[PDB]
RNA sequence: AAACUUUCAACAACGGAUCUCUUGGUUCUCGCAUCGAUGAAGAACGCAGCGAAAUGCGAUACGUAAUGUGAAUUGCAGAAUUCCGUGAAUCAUCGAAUCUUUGAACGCACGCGCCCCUUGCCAGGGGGCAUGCCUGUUUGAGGUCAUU
């Protein structure tokens, strides 16, 4: 069997289900060198012109109910960031997402269990936590 | 004498010489430019029911695809055909396919490796990986200049 390091370099796992999986993140690296070239040129207009995961979601979760498997960690991370070198815009977006989720939950009032704890106020709809 | 040597008329054998002819050769004149990595010429193996040569064909193998003709092919068997019909010919045209192994011959050589993928540790199935050079994209390394 191909080792994890060897498989990653080529791209313990089954080779049958990994070889076919070899098929914009790599292309984005060119933007760094283009920006460096623009900086070297000393003009910012070209830099401004240069400046101007749905696919993975479906395969991981082919159906909406399947999202519940990872929704625990998803909500945990989102709520942790909502209260936390992360940019302020990322924090604001995470807080807005959590606020919208809470508003929708309150609209339907789909809550069954709660538990105030030292770690945080636990909740159940699916279980989720907020600090 | 018979037998046997020799000249000649007739009869009986060789060979195709003479005569007649040819889907032939040679020579003259006229129109055109038409080989090849999108794989040339050439060589080997197979293909028709029966097959020596020639021609055609490449496991779709004396052919497959398409149009015209309209009732065949023929040495033998065999097929039919609704033949008033989108339909037979070993017919003609031929623009669409297949195109075995070699061969400029092209994975590495003087047997024999790799990407791919697939339908079921492992495999069938399908295309490629030769060298010289031109344009473009990607990565890596090294000389100049800048670095308050």
From Swiss-Prot:
Consequence of gene disruption: Essential gene. Reduced assembly of 60S ribosomes and accumulation of halfmer polyribosomes.
Keywords: Coiled coil, Nucleus, Phosphoprotein, Ribosome biogenesis, rRNA processing
Gene: NOP7
Full protein: residues contained: 15 to 202 of 605
GO annotation, cellular component aspect: nucleolus; nucleoplasm; nucleus; PeBoW complex; preribosome, large subunit precursor
Example GO BP: maturation of LSU-rRNA from tricistronic rRNA transcript (SSU-rRNA, 5.8S rRNA, LSU-rRNA)
Annotated compartments: Nucleus, Nucleolus; Nucleus, Nucleoplasm
Subunit structure: Component of the NOP7 complex, composed of ERB1, NOP7 and YTM1. The complex is held together by ERB1, which interacts with NOP7 via its N-terminal domain and with YTM1 via a high-affinity interaction between the seven-bladed beta-propeller domains of the 2 proteins. The NOP7 complex associates with the 66S pre-ribosome. Also interacts with NOG1. May also associate with the origin recognition complex (ORC complex).
Induction summary: Expression is down-regulated prior to the diauxic shift.
GO MF annotation terms: large ribosomal subunit rRNA binding; mRNA binding; ribonucleoprotein complex binding; RNA binding; rRNA binding
Miscellaneous comment text of the record: Present with 4530 molecules/cell in log phase SD medium.
Protein name: Pescadillo homolog
Family (UniProt): Belongs to the pescadillo family.
Function comment: Component of the NOP7 complex, which is required for maturation of the 25S and 5.8S ribosomal RNAs and formation of the 60S ribosome.
């Amino acid at each position: 069997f191909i080792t994890r390091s060897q498989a990653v370099r080529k791209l313990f796992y089954y080779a049958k289900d990994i070889q076919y999986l070899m098929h914009k993140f790599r292309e984005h690296k060119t933007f760094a060198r283009k920006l460096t070239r623009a900086l070297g040129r000393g003009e910012v207009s070209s830099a401004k012109r240069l400046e101007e995961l749905d696919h993975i979601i479906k395969e991981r979760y082919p159906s909406f109910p399947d999202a519940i498997r990872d929704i625990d960690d998803a909500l945990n991370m989102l709520f942790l960031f909502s209260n936390l070198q992360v940019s302020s815009k990322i924090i604001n977006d995470a807080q807005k997402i959590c606020n919208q989720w809470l508003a929708y939950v309150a609209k339907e009032r789909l809550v069954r269990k709660v538990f105030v704890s030292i770690k945080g106020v636990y909740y159940q709809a699916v279980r989720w936590l907020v600090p």
